[PDB]
Amino acid sequence: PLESQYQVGPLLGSGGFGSVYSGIRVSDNLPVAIKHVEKDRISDWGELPNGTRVPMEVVLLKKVSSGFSGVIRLLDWFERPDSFVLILERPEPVQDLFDFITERGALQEELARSFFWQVLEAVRHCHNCGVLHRDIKDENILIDLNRGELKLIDFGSGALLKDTVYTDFDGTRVYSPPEWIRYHRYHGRSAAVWSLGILLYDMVCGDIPFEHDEEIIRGQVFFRQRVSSECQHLIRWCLALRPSDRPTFEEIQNHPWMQDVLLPQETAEIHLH
């Protein structure tokens, strides 16, 4: 079942998401990632078209898993007595964006643009498929270093997308919007756009803009690195205090800072190889 089909490799890491291992699919030597989650730690359950009780993460991944490569593909999954196991794709060589930024510091704007654009395409794809990630951040983005392609990972804090208010949140606090901090209420799209402003700031400054609740609520952005005025403007727009003042995905991608994006392969050749 799981035992024979996959050869298990080293532990890649563990956290709120559970424990993830490197691995190889025995049949064709396909590189994979093997993710284990205990049932006790799963608060958010969902149901398949089969009518089967699984972790919401499995529901969400199946809804977004198609030829589009901006989201990590779910290859298979298994239930065990006290856990679920997910077999996910694994690009090779790969590095998560948090580690990449830690090593480089602030990213050049051309590179940040390419990366941010790909994140946007991936988030739009999720939203089109009825899925809200709810934990967009550097740690949850992988870079395929050869192709220069980014992938979203870890849908364990996600939800079905809806147009009504959310009153639960389980993502990362420092990426969460002021309406959550103050009222424990938010809407999907506008909260996602706030997290994208935090992410963009992180890319171009090398760290997140806010640490404490009061800074989030105050929403005053200070630039610690040299950042173009157009990029500063896009960031401040994404981080508007009122949800309804934030741009739509379309407005973000039509913003002047976002024009003439590099292709992924060009991005790898210039910045990654």
Ligand SMILES: Fc1cccc(F)c1-c1ccc2[nH]nc(-c3cncc(O[C@H]4CNCCC45CC5)n3)c2c1
């Ligand atoms: F294979 C890898 C090597 C180095 C870093 C990586 F992130 C990976 C990798 C490759 C394929 C993957 N598919 N899914 C994951 C995954 C899923 N959920 C969580 C998660 O967390 C990792 C990324 N941020 C830091 C913590 C982490 C354990 C290392 N990865 C995945 C990861």
